[PDB]
Design a protein around this ligand. Structure first.
Ligand code: OM1
Ligand code: OM1
Ligand code: CL
Ligand code: CL
Lengths: 149, 149
């Protein structure tokens, strides 16, 4: 569980927001891309795995599961590439609610930047710092530290 | 100390590599940009602070210290923007040795990607995972977790 991440792709302003969620904590990283490609997804995962100990990634769709480039990135970075089948139906709703939350935050900050990518990074910040009382950022560090110890 | 980061800018292939180093652990994040601007530096810091609890950033030079855009990003993200004056002379050598190490790793991976940004992210991965026996990635998580607790 400490090493399990889930990919998620959502759309806004004719662009794609690619999100990685640390399942156990709700911590996220995200980027804006023109379109979801294996190339972009592969690069995103390479970045993620250099920053956090990513053991397993549940891909967001079958195209990214199939993509040889995504498979190669997962090979390179020592990531177990898995499907994203919601054998637990609650997964679906959690991701959906997260996308709605993220879009809400983006709306709340949208006039504070010209570019969508800037607003998205503001949303990442706000999401990860929000106390629910610990924040997702606090939870991921505690979970991983406990695992190391 | 758990919240202290240092910016560092180095050059390769006619491009700029912007690095943030977590001082206490040696953990890094990095990106390739065409040139160092306040705009790019500001965006980089916004990304960093959404991902880690960045309390203080020692800027890499006077232009980024002066930049109103960098100041505004630091304001937005709750970062104390400071100078990078090496009152401790050892800081200089550590950063310089890090740049040499990073460039060495980039050379070792360079033929595994077309684009420099990809090689840089591979270097980030290798640097953060390298056991010296804990890795920088393990050290940053332990330092921050201890601070939370
Ligand atoms: C991240 O640093 C920040 C600096 C300042 C502010 C406060 N907001 C404004 O001053 C503002 C508000 C509305 C439109 C334009 C602006 C000025 N431009 C902000 C900006 C900076 C760096 C970037 C950007 C943008 C962008 O506008 O998208 O895009 C990629 O790198 C927020 C964040
Ligand atoms: C990150 O996923 C990886 C997938 C595969 C490999 C193994 N290496 C090769 O197959 C290779 C080797 C040499 C030249 C071109 C290639 C193929 N292209 C790799 C690539 C992928 C995604 C990107 C890229 C690049 C790039 O070439 O820079 O740039 C931004 O997004 C490494 C990383
Ligand atoms: Cl798409
Ligand atoms: Cl420059």
């Amino acid at each position: 569980s400490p090493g399990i991440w889930q990919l998620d792709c959502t759309h806004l302003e004719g662009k794609v927001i690619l999100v990685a969620v640390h399942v156990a904590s709700g911590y996220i990283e995200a980027e804006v891309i023109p379109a979801e490609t294996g190339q972009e997804t592969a690069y995103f995962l390479l970045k993620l795995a250099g920053r956090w100990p990513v053991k397993t990634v549940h891909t967001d769709n079958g195209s990214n599961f199939t993509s040889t480039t995504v498979k190669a990135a997962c090979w390179w970075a020592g990531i177990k590439q898995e499907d994203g089948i919601p054998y637990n139906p609650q997964s679906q709703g959690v991701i959906e609610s997260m996308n709605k939350e993220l879009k809400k935050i983006i709306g709340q900050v949208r006039d504070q930047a010209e570019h969508l990518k800037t607003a998205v990074q503001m949303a990442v910040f706000i999401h990860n710092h929000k106390r629910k009382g610990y924040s997702a950022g606090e939870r991921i560090v505690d979970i991983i530290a406990t695992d190391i110890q």
